[PDB]
Amino acid sequence: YTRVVWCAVGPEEQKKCQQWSQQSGQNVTCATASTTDDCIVLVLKGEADALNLDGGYIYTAGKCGLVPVLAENRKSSKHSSLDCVLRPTEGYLAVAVVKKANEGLTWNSLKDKKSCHTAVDRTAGWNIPMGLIVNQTGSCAFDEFFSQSCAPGADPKSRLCALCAGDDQGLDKCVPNSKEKYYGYTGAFRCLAEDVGDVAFVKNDTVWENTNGESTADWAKNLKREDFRLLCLDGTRKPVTEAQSCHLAVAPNHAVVSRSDRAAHVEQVLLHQQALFGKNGKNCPDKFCLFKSETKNLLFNDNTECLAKLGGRPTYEEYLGTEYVTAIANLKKCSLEACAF
Numbered sequence: 001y002t003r004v005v006w007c008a009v010g011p012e013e014q015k016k017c018q019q020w021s022q023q024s025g026q027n028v029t030c031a032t033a034s035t036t037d038d039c040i041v042l043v044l045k046g047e048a049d050a051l052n053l054d055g056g057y058i059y060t061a062g063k064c065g066l067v068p069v070l071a072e073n074r075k076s077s078k079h080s081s082l083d084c085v086l087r088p089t090e091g092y093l094a095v096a097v098v099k100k101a102n103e104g105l106t107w108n109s110l111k112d113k114k115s116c117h118t119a120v121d122r123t124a125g126w127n128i129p130m131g132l133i134v135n136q137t138g139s140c141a142f143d144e145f146f147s148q149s150c151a152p153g154a155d156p157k158s159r160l161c162a163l164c165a166g167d168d169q170g171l172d173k174c175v176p177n178s179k180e181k182y183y184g185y186t187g188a189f190r191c192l193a194e195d196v197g198d199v200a201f202v203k204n205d206t207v208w209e210n211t212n213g214e215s216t217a218d219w220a221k222n223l224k225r226e227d228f229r230l231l232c233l234d235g236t237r238k239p240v241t242e243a244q245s246c247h248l249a250v251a252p253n254h255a256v257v258s259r260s261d262r263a264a265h266v267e268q269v270l271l272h273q274q275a276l277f278g279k280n281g282k283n284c285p286d287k288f289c290l291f292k293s294e295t296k297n298l299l300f301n302d303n304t305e306c307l308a309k310l311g312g313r314p315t316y317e318e319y320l321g322t323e324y325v326t327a328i329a330n331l332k333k334c335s336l337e338a339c340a341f
């Protein structure tokens with residue numbers, strides 16, 4: 001009945017889950033997979049219960065029957081009275097970021113540049129930006145637009161993996177899990193910060209979180225915001241402060257998914273679990289925090305205040321919204337009702 005097998009992607013996430021599992025008295029247990037796609041398979045098979053997922057993977061998962069349960073919620077300034085759990089989710093701002101010194105570089109001079117993506121099939125990293133780029137260009141040749149990239153999940157032998165580093169040993173080049181140096185929001189941003197790339201497709205929170213002494217991490221301590229710039233679709237360039245008026249799209253929050261025959265029970269264990277290890281949780285600061293991993297967004301983005309109830313008991317199409325659901329479907333014409341397993 002009341003035991004949840006969570007699916008960790010990669011070895012860094014397995015160690016946070018094991019610790020979570022240590023402190024939960026087996027209320028949560030951990031399966032492990034190499035890539036998000038594999039984890040979705042494990043949950044389909046019933047060998048794992050649930051996992052937190054970027055909107056891009058939620059669309060894959062959805063075609064395969066999986067259902068969103070709870071969603072991540074960050075610090076908000078509208079909806080002050082409402083408790084985090086009952087508070088509506090705001091989404092997040094996909095942005096294209098560049099280095100200020102890289103003068104001249106505009107959304108209209110991206111062709112043949114170098115790019116940093118979070119991973120293939122994710123929202124801010126891949127689907128919005130590449131979606132705009134296929135539309136604007138009239139061609140599915142997205143593999144020929146940037147000269148070199150790090151798009152974790154693309155063919156290791158391809159130009160789309162050229163700029164990825166792999167792990168400390170140089171192994172696992174381009175793998176779509178935290179072992180890649182330039183995987184996910186932080187890695188894609190680092191990718192630009194180290195001047196490995198000309199542009200990084202991350203979200204707004206990422207720039208702020210890793211700049212102005214916020215990360216303390218070796219590669220990020222000396223980073224200042226004012227050395228960065230966003231690329232608007234109006235061909236302009238703005239400071240990281242004008243995010244609301246210079247973004248590519250608003251992205252539906254990452255959410256936990258499960259099989260629907262389990263959602264009721266996944267939902268219950270987790271609400272309890274967060275009362276214990278969440279932002280103001282009984283045993284967070286002292287013993288263990290579910291929502292902290294030191295700029296590494298492991299299992300959950302470090303900016304999650306809490307996971308929140310959904311309300312409108314929404315399906316996956318409704319959760320992602322008809323706007324975004326069309327964006328992906330158009331883009332998948334390039335690579336029409338499926339379940340890719």
Ligand SMILES: *[C@@H]1O[C@H](CO)[C@@H](O[C@@H]2O[C@H](CO)[C@@H](O[C@@H]3O[C@H](CO)[C@@H](O[C@@H]4O[C@H](CO)[C@@H](O[C@H]5O[C@H](CO)[C@@H](O[C@@H]6O[C@H](CO)[C@@H](O)[C@H](O)[C@@H]6O)[C@H](O)[C@@H]5O)[C@H](O)[C@@H]4O)[C@H](O)[C@@H]3O)[C@H](O)[C@H]2NC(C)=O)[C@H](O)[C@H]1NC(C)=O
Pocket residue numbers: 075076077080204205206208209214242243244303
């Ligand atoms: C892109 O992503 C960035 C990073 O994620 C994000 O920046 C982050 O924003 C959040 C909030 O959205 C910041 O957190 C906040 O920081 C402050 C200061 O350290 C914290 O302290 C205060 O918290 C108060 C309690 O919530 C807050 O009250 C708020 O509510 C009151 C009343 O409801 C209201 O206050 C107003 O004050 C007026 C002046 O006297 C007064 O006349 C008026 O009547 C009014 O009541 C405001 O609504 C207020 O927001 C205080 O205002 C303080 O904020 C606070 O708890 C919270 O922790 C993050 O620090 C920040 N990240 C970084 C790295 O700085 C960007 O904003 C994102 N960009 C976009 C476009 O979304």
Ligand SMILES: *[C@@H]1O[C@H](CO)[C@@H](O[C@@H]2O[C@H](CO)[C@@H](O[C@H]3O[C@H](CO[C@H]4O[C@H](CO)[C@@H](O)[C@H](O)[C@@H]4O)[C@@H](O[C@@H]4O[C@H](CO)[C@@H](O)[C@H](O)[C@@H]4O)[C@H](O)[C@@H]3O)[C@H](O)[C@H]2NC(C)=O)[C@H](O)[C@H]1NC(C)=O
Pocket residue numbers: 127128131132135322323326327330
């Ligand atoms: C890449 O490029 C493709 C090709 O253009 C693009 O796909 C297209 O996206 C469009 C926008 O997302 C789609 O148009 C949509 O809007 C209409 C209108 O409905 C909306 O407007 C009304 C009034 O303003 C609102 O009240 C309503 O809430 C909607 O927001 C949609 O169809 C409408 O449906 C309503 C139902 O209430 C009817 O009453 C209307 O008469 C009308 O039929 C439509 O379903 C779209 O959501 C367009 O459909 C879509 N084209 C194709 C072939 O799929 C991608 O979005 C681009 N991608 C990226 C990344 O930009």
Ligand SMILES: *[C@@H]1O[C@H](CO)[C@@H](O[C@@H]2O[C@H](CO)[C@@H](O)[C@H](O)[C@H]2NC(C)=O)[C@H](O)[C@H]1NC(C)=O
Pocket residue numbers: 002023024025027272
């Ligand atoms: C594992 O989960 C169970 C279910 O919530 C917890 O046992 C309940 O905990 C609450 C709070 O202590 C009690 O009020 C209930 O009486 C307990 N029993 C039930 C309802 O079965 C337990 O606390 C969790 N264990 C850990 C270590 O997190």
Ligand SMILES: OC[C@H]1O[C@H](O)[C@H](O)[C@@H](O)[C@@H]1O
Pocket residue numbers: 089090091250251252253318319320321
């Ligand atoms: O406008 C963006 C919105 O898109 C979707 O409906 C999401 O479910 C919601 O979190 C987000 O606020």
Ligand SMILES: [Fe+3]
Pocket residue numbers: 054055122123124251254
């Ligand atoms: Fe995302």
Ligand SMILES: [Zn+2]
Pocket residue numbers: 247249250
């Ligand atoms: Zn907008």
Ligand SMILES: [Zn+2]
Pocket residue numbers: 312313314315318
């Ligand atoms: Zn509905």
